[PDB]
Design a protein around this nucleic acid. Structure first.
Ligand SMILES: [Mg+2]
Length: 78
RNA sequence: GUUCGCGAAGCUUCGUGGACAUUUGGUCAAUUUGAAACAAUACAGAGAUGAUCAGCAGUUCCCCUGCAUAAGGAUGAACCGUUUUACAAAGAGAUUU
């Protein structure tokens, strides 16, 4: 099992290396093939449970989130 | 077209008023682009445990075969990994006011 895992990891790194090599060309990372209608847990958001609308509700939270996300764009860029 | 009445020409023929009968079918339109699977090649490859092997379950936002609430599917599939805080009390030494 461990060996299999290791192999998988190796494969993944190889893939990454390949993409790095062919970076000047536009390249997309291959997704794990689905077996019987599953979720790719990047998109969609998985089975979300609510924030639960409370009494002392303030709208700065959204702003904060946006701010947080701004930084990650920068990271992506670099 | 059927016909039951009226009006003109020669029971036969035209012109009319009515009655009869009355709204089908499509969640679909014919080849690639609205989603079938096996197969094949290559590559590995078989539950515990030292090894070999049986069977049963269990969890799941995985299913298949099965008439099935039988039974069977690699022990049917994935589970084998990650694992640092409701965290306080006492003692000793050090820098800052
Ligand atoms: Mg068996």
């Amino acid at each position: 099992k461990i060996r299999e895992r290791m192999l998988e990891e190796s494969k993944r790194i190889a893939e990454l290396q390949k993409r790095r090599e062919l970076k000047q060309a536009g390249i997309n990372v291959a997704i794990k093939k689905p077996k019987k209608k599953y979720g790719t847990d990047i998109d969609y958001n998985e089975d979300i449970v609510y924030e639960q609308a409370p009494m002392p509700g303030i709208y700065d939270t959204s702003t904060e989130d946006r701010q947080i996300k701004k930084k990650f764009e920068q990271f992506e860029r670099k």
